[PDB]
Every structure is written in structure tokens, then in C-alpha cells.
């Protein structure tokens, strides 16, 4: 029974953080919550927070309000791999029904290198950085994720036709890892083709690995295929075995305390959390109990949406997770 | 009679140029194609003489030259070399829902205006030390102003009402910021046109759910690559949508998605619609508007008939059967 640094965050942060804990022990989970506040000071994040995370290794983070803490937590814990598994959800139906993609985004260098120069008046050069080190590391993580999560194919996504030196070296590191891991089927594809086919037949894609800006855009389009950021789990993996799993929707301050929110997304990042540790049994139950709640009917939130409030939704998940 | 440069390209390009000639013959279009070819050769003499022919002719219709991304960075994409050498700064494509092609989303009518010469297509890279590669995306004021002018003039002349600038200025603060601000400046000269803006991530999310909210869109080069292909796919795929490339004097027409289609080439299954619509836009540009309209109504009429559909859009017919139907629709328009 280990401890998980909890970061409720602002607006609807606390309510959906309450809903996740309620379901987490309604379901026998060997997890106890060590709440914490994260915030820039002096910048920095508090002593309070840096040492919980460097002790527990596992955090779950709600919607923070808006130095970028997105960027702070990345640089403070070396969050180098953004993971977003998108799965169509029965009951919450979009025009796309067959989706099951995992996007794996390099999260340190790439187009978000922070280097821009004004070359002269009216002429800006923004510098994209691609390194042997980081590309190899996100590729190793991509293939390791594919095995441990029983995944058949890993596609590298690139534009090495246009950006030959940089996207090329990213690709070169994906190739070297793939020849050292023939268990998993590897292909390459241009970003524009991946975009073109995604909105036509998303079902043909398995694990997508790609550098920073492409991963930023694709992860969002995929989540748009399954229903939005209100239903999307996300995780970030760092150095020395730290990992932070999170909401990525807004705080929704205008309904912040009216039992009206929907905790699906953070609850699913928690599920994704357990799976990361171990505890698949608990994950499968919580997840299945969630999936069955959304499909069965009018116990639905307003934003998904029915006319039931957040802890009616949450309590039915508790009701059903107790009957494995 | 006009003389047009024709670059057949790779993949489905060659076969589809033949049907373009064939359709122009039946319609008696006063246009003579002057073909130039571009090989795989690392040497640039092919691509350079294609450029000089377009300088001579001012108008061209082209397939897609394949780019081998396994060759060294010195071997740059010829499609890009053409685009930038000739300074065709505006990539324009028009994605509109085709009533005969039923997809997940209806009521789509989006003009996309894409800066076509600058950006992350500048081909400026270097390895400072072993394993450390830098690439310089270039945004300038003169080119951001230029593209923004075009999108707004387009929006007005075609009676649209909203331009949406697409960008990553919240993270690419200087580069994308400069582009966004050039748009804003132009916006202030078109008070009658609603100006909005949106981040490229959230734009792709809105496209796959509510793409009816977009009217005209303008953006820098890579984001256009993404948005063109997203919207091409939404309305039915790469065989349907034409694209144009405009400079101040030169103009070059093609398929919107810029794909060679090597995996379906030479099996008489390619969809000729994108290529045909591209050649009508070329006819409009040449002020041959009556020929453009005859052929465009024919091709569109054929898409209405499910029986004419190629496999890219769920059908079973051949290219040649589609071209047959198109010619049948022209052969009654002109007597």
C-alpha cells in the first residue's frame, strides 16, 4: 500500500479529485492520497511538492489554473514522454467509433526548444532542436510501452522529406531501436498522411511515436476523435522513475462547486496510473465500472451529457465497482 | 491558344495527365501542353529547366514529384524547390462537401490559404556537434503580410465573412507572434470581415468535431500541410480536392494533398476528380471560364452517381469508366 502525491488543483480540481478517491477505495485500492499544492515561488515549485514526488514517484494532477507549470513540472522532473491513449467510448458517441490509438510525444526538445532569434527587423528564426539522446530515449520508451501494454504496431511520424537532417535523425533513432525489438511491428509515415488517414479510418493506427510539435497536435486531434479533453487520460513519464498522470481539460471555474462537473478524464488517468504501477485488476474494474456507467444511460453528467450531477455519476461507479 | 507547362510527376501523375489531355480534346480546349519531366537524379538541371519553362509559360499543371527522404539533406525536395524558386507564396485549396460523397461530416465549406515559401520549409539545418541538429523555421513580416493580404482579399471577393488565423503563438512567441500580428494589421483594413484566431492543436480538434464553424483560414507553412490534409480527409480524401499555387505573376495547379499515390498507380483505379478540378482552376486562371465551367459541371455531375466512384471513395469503378462518364457529360454541353 503505497502513497500517491495528489494535486487537486483549481476550479473543479477538488471535486473530481474527491470523486476519484471515493471510487479508488470503494474499489479496494492499495492507494492513499498525500494531497499537495503546486505553485511557482521565489521560479520553483514548493518544497512541499518536489519531495513528495521524489519519494512516492507517482502523482495525479487535476486542472491547474493559468512561467508555465506545464513547463515547470517538465523541467523539474525531466518529463520526457507524453502519453495519450485514445479509445472510443461506448455510450459517448462521436462520428468515430473504432479508435484505439496511443500517441507518444517526445516532450523535451524539438520545436519547443525555447530558442528564437530576431535575425533582423521583421525576420525571426525559431530553432527546432533534435538530438540523438532524446530521440533514442523516446523511441526506447515507445517500444517498451508497446510490449508492456500488448501492442502490435508502432509508427514513427515525421516530415523528413522537408526537414531531412532533423526529422531524419529522429527517424534514424527509431529505426535502430526497431531492429533491436522485432517483437513489435514498425513503420514510418509522413505527418500529413497520418493526418489525412486519421480522419478517414482511425482504426488503422496503433502506437504513434513522434517529436514534440507533431505529438502536441496529433494527441489533440485524436482526443477530438473520441469526444474531447473531458474524457481523455494523459500521462507524463520522467527521470528516476517518476510519472505524473493528469487531467488536460480546463478548470471550468464557472461551475467550480456545484456538483456539476465530470471526473471521467482524471479518473481514467488514475486508471492509467494504476496500470503504470501494477494493480491491473483494480484498473480493469474501475475502468469497466466507468465504461458501463456511461453506456447504461441517464446517470450522465451535463457535459457528456445527461441531467445528473457529479456524485450521482460517481456513486453509480462506486455501486458497480463493488460487484466485480 | 495558350501554352501551359505540364510536369507529369511520379505515381498516378503520368496516367492522370493523359486523361486531362483526353478531356481537353473532347471539350476542344485551346490549350497546348508543353511537357517537362523531372527525374530522381540528384542533379538539379531537370528541376531548373522546369522552372524556366514556367517562367516562360507563366502557368503550369503538375503531378507530385516523389521525395526520397533517405538521401542526404543536400538532395532537397523538388516540389519545394519549384514552389520557392518561383515564389508561389499562396497555397489555396477549397474543401467543400460533395453531395454525392457521403462522409461523417456534412456542410463543410472551407477556403484554406497557406503561406507556401517560408516557415519550416526553409531547408536550413546544421549539425553543430555530433548528435545535435538545429533547424531554423523562418517567419518574416513581408511574407506574413503578403499571405494575410491574400486571404483577406480572397475572403471579400468571394463574399466570405470570417478569416481565422491558425498559429502556435502562445509557444512560438516571436515567430508565430509575428505572423499573427501581420494578420491583425491586415484585419484592420477589412473591418467588414470577422477576424478570429485559434491554436493549431485546438483547430484540429474543432475540425474533427465541428468543421462547419470555419470559413476562410490562413496560416504558416507546416500548419497548412496539416490542415489541408485534415480537411481533404473530412470531405472524402485525396482524390477529390484541387489545389492552386499563386505568385504575383506565376501560377501552378495540382491536387490539394500533394501525394504521388505510388501504391495505386498503374492499376486504372486513381480518382481523376482532384486532377480534373485542378485543370479547371487552371482554365479559370487563363480566363477560359466557359471551358472551365463545362468540364467542372461534368466532373461534379459524375461524382453524384455512386456507380462512377473509384475505390478511394468506396466505389468499384475504374479511372477510365469515370473519364467516360465525364466525357459523356461534356459531349452534350457543346453540341
Listing DSSP states for B187-239 in one string gives: HTT-TTSEEEEEEHHHHHHHHTT-GGG-SEEEE-HHHHHHHHHHHHHHHT-TT
- What's the grid cell of residue A117? 532569434
Position of cell 484505439?
A100
For residues B272 and A242, give the distance between their C-alpha atoms in angstroms, rounded to a whole number. 53
Record: contact B205-A166, CB cut-off 8 A: no
- What's the grid cell of residue A284? 480493469
Does residue A281 contact residue A275 with C-beta atoms inside 8 Å? Answer: no
Most B CBs within 10 A among A127, A132, A195, hence the mutation to make, goes to: A195
Q: Name the residue among A181, A194, A189, A184 with its Cα closest to residue A153.
A: A184
Burial B29-50 (b: 16+ CB within 10 A, else e): bebebeebebeeeeeeebbeeb
- What's the grid cell of residue B134? 538545429
Range of the domain at B208: 1-335
Does residue A286 contact residue A266 with C-beta atoms inside 8 Å? Answer: no
The partner residue sitting opposite B233, judged by closest CB among A171, A197, A213, is A197
Does residue A293 contact residue A320 with C-beta atoms inside 8 Å? Answer: yes
By the CB < 8 Å criterion, does A169 face chain B? Answer: yes
Q: Scanning every residue of chain B, which has its alpha carbon at the shortest distance from the alpha carbon of A93?
A: B209
Q: Tell me the chain B residues in contact with residue A225 when contact means C-beta distances shorter than 8 Å.
A: 208
Name the domain count of chain B.
1
For residues A233 and A252, give the distance between their C-alpha atoms in angstroms, rounded to a whole number. 17
Residues contacting residue B147 through CB under 8 Å, at least 6 positions apart = B89, B90, B113, B114, B115, B116, B218, B220
- A36 labelled as ligand-binding? no
Rg, Å, chain A Cα set: 20
DSSP assigned state of A41: B
Rg, Å, chain B Cα set: 20
| 3-state SS class at B60 | strand
Does residue A129 contact residue A109 with C-beta atoms inside 8 Å? Answer: yes
For residues B182 and A36, give the distance between their C-alpha atoms in angstroms, rounded to a whole number. 43
Q: Name the residue among B248, B303, B264 with its Cα closest to residue B12.
A: B264
The partner residue sitting opposite A162, judged by closest CB among B75, B121, B205, is B121
Does residue A124 contact residue A116 with C-beta atoms inside 8 Å? Answer: yes
Does residue A233 contact residue A16 with C-beta atoms inside 8 Å? Answer: no
Burial A17-30 (b: 16+ CB within 10 A, else e): bbbbbbbbebbebe
Biggest distance spanned by C-alpha atoms of chain A: 67
The partner residue sitting opposite A116, judged by closest CB among B135, B140, B174, is B174
For residues B308 and B318, give the distance between their C-alpha atoms in angstroms, rounded to a whole number. 8
For residues B330 and B333, give the distance between their C-alpha atoms in angstroms, rounded to a whole number. 5
- What's the grid cell of residue A106? 517526445
Residues contacting residue B242 through CB under 8 Å, at least 6 positions apart = B93, B94, B253, B254, B255, B256, B274, B275, B277, B278, B280, B281
For residues A209 and A199, give the distance between their C-alpha atoms in angstroms, rounded to a whole number. 18
Residues in A 269-288 with any Cβ partner in B closer than 8 A: none
Name the domain count of chain A.
1
- A216 labelled as ligand-binding? yes
List beta partners, residue B204: none
Residues contacting residue B23 through CB under 8 Å, at least 6 positions apart = B276, B279, B295, B323, B326, B327, B330
Most B CBs within 10 A among A110, A132, A158, A199, hence the mutation to make, goes to: A199
Does residue A56 contact residue A5 with C-beta atoms inside 8 Å? Answer: yes
Position of cell 492507494?
A31
Write down the experimental method used for this entry. X-ray
Q: CA A220, A224, A227: angle at the middle one, nearest 5?
A: 135
Residue B322 gets the label, from left (phi > 0), alpha (psi -120 to 50) or beta, of: alpha
Q: Name the residue among A62, A16, A1, A76 with its Cα closest to residue A239.
A: A76
Q: Name the residue among A121, A111, A183 with its Cα closest to residue A152.
A: A183
Resolution of this entry, Å: 2.5
- What's the grid cell of residue B276? 480534373
- What's the grid cell of residue B131? 548528435
Residues in A 113-132 with any Cβ partner in B closer than 8 A: 116-118, 121-132
For residues A240 and A263, give the distance between their C-alpha atoms in angstroms, rounded to a whole number. 29
Q: Tell me the chain A residues in contact with residue B178 when contact means C-beta distances shorter than 8 Å.
A: 122, 124
Amino acid at each position: 500500500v503505497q502513497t500517491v502525491t495528489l494535486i487537486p488543483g483549481d476550479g473543479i480540481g477538488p471535486e473530481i479529485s474527491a470523486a476519484v478517491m471515493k471510487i479508488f477505495d470503494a474499489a479496494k485500492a492499495p492507494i492513499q492520497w498525500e494531497e499537495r499544492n503546486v505553485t511557482a515561488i521565489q521560479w520553483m515549485i514548493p518544497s512541499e511538492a518536489k519531495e513528495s514526488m521524489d519519494k512516492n514517484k507517482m502523482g495525479l494532477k487535476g486542472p491547474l489554473k493559468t512561467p508555465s507549470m506545464n513547463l515547470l513540472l517538465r523541467k523539474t522532473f525531466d518529463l520526457y514522454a507524453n502519453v495519450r491513449p485514445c479509445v472510443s467510448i461506448e455510450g459517448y458517441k462521436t462520428p468515430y467509433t473504432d479508435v484505439n490509438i496511443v500517441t507518444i510525444r517526445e516532450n523535451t526538445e524539438g520545436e519547443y526548444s525555447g530558442i528564437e532569434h530576431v535575425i533582423v527587423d521583421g525576420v525571426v528564426a525559431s530553432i527546432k532542436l533534435i538530438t540523438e539522446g532524446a530521440s533514442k530515449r523516446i523511441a526506447e520508451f515507445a517500444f517498451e510501452y508497446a510490449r508492456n501494454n500488448h501492442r502490435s504496431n508502432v509508427t514513427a511520424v515525421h516530415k523528413a522529406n522537408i526537414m531531412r537532417m532533423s526529422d531524419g535523425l529522429f527517424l534514424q533513432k527509431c529505426r535502430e531501436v526497431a531492429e533491436s525489438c522485432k517483437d513489435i511491428k514498425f513503420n514510418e509515415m509522413y505527418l500529413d498522411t497520418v493526418c489525412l488517414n486519421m480522419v478517414q479510418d482511425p482504426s488503422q493506427f496503433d502506437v504513434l511515436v513522434m517529436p514534440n510539435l507533431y505529438g502536441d497536435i496529433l494527441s489533440d486531434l485524436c482526443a477530438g476523435l473520441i469526444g474531447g479533453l473531458g474524457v481523455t487520460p494523459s500521462g507524463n513519464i520522467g527521470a528516476n522513475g517518476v510519472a505524473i498522470f493528469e487531467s488536460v481539460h480546463g478548470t471550468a471555474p464557472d461551475i467550480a462547486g456545484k456538483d456539476m462537473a465530470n471526473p471521467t478524464a482524471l479518473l481514467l488517468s488514475a486508471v492509467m496510473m494504476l496500470r503504470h504501477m501494477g494493480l491491473f485488476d483494480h484498473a480493469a474494474r474501475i475502468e469497466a465500472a466507468c465504461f458501463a456507467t456511461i453506456k447504461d444511460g441517464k446517470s450522465l453528467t451535463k457535459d457528456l451529457g445527461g441531467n445528473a450531477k457529479c456524485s450521482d455519476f460517481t456513486e453509480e461507479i462506486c455501486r458497480r465497482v463493488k460487484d466485480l | 491558344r495558350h501554352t501551359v507547362t505540364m510536369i507529369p510527376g511520379d505515381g498516378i501523375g503520368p496516367e492522370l495527365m493523359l486523361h486531362v489531355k483526353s478531356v481537353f480534346r473532347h471539350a476542344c480546349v485551346p490549350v497546348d501542353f508543353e511537357e517537362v519531366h523531372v527525374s530522381s537524379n540528384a542533379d538539379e538541371e531537370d528541376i531548373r529547366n522546369a522552372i524556366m519553362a514556367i517562367r516562360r509559360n507563366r502557368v503550369a499543371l503538375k503531378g507530385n514529384i516523389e521525395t526520397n527522404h533517405n538521401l542526404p539533406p543536400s538532395h532537397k525536395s523538388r516540389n519545394n524547390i519549384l514552389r520557392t524558386s518561383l515564389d508561389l507564396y499562396a497555397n489555396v485549396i477549397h474543401c467543400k462537401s460533395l453531395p454525392g460523397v457521403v462522409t461523417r461530416h456534412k456542410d463543410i465549406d472551407i477556403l484554406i490559404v497557406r503561406e507556401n515559401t517560408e516557415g519550416e520549409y526553409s531547408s536550413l539545418e546544421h549539425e553543430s556537434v555530433a548528435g545535435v541538429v538545429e533547424s531554423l523555421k523562418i517567419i518574416t513580416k513581408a511574407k506574413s503580410l503578403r499571405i494575410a493580404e491574400y486571404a483577406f482579399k480572397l475572403a471579400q471577393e468571394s463574399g466570405r465573412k470570417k478569416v481565422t488565423a491558425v498559429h502556435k503563438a502562445n509557444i512560438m512567441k516571436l515567430g508565430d507572434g509575428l505572423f499573427l500580428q501581420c494578420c491583425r494589421e491586415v484585419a484592420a483594413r477589412y473591418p467588414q470581415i470577422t477576424f478570429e484566431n485559434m491554436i493549431v492543436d485546438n483547430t484540429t480538434m474543432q475540425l474533427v468535431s465541428r468543421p462547419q464553424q470555419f470559413d476562410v483560414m490562413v496560416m504558416p507553412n507546416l500548419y497548412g500541410n496539416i490542415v489541408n490534409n485534415v480537411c481533404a480527409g473530412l470531405v472524402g480524401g485525396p482524390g477529390l480536392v484541387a489545389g492552386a499555387n499563386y505568385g504575383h505573376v506565376y501560377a501552378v495547379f495540382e491536387t490539394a494533398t500533394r501525394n504521388t499515390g505510388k501504391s495505386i498507380a498503374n492499376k486504372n483505379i486513381a480518382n481523376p476528380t482532384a486532377t480534373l478540378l485542378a485543370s479547371c482552376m487552371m482554365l479559370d486562371h487563363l480566363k477560359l471560364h466557359s471551358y472551365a465551367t463545362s468540364i467542372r459541371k461534368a466532373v461534379l455531375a459524375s461524382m453524384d452517381n455512386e456507380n462512377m466512384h473509384t475505390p478511394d471513395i468506396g466505389g468499384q469503378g475504374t479511372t477510365s469508366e469515370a473519364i467516360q462518364d465525364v466525357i459523356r457529360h461534356i459531349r452534350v454541353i457543346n453540341g
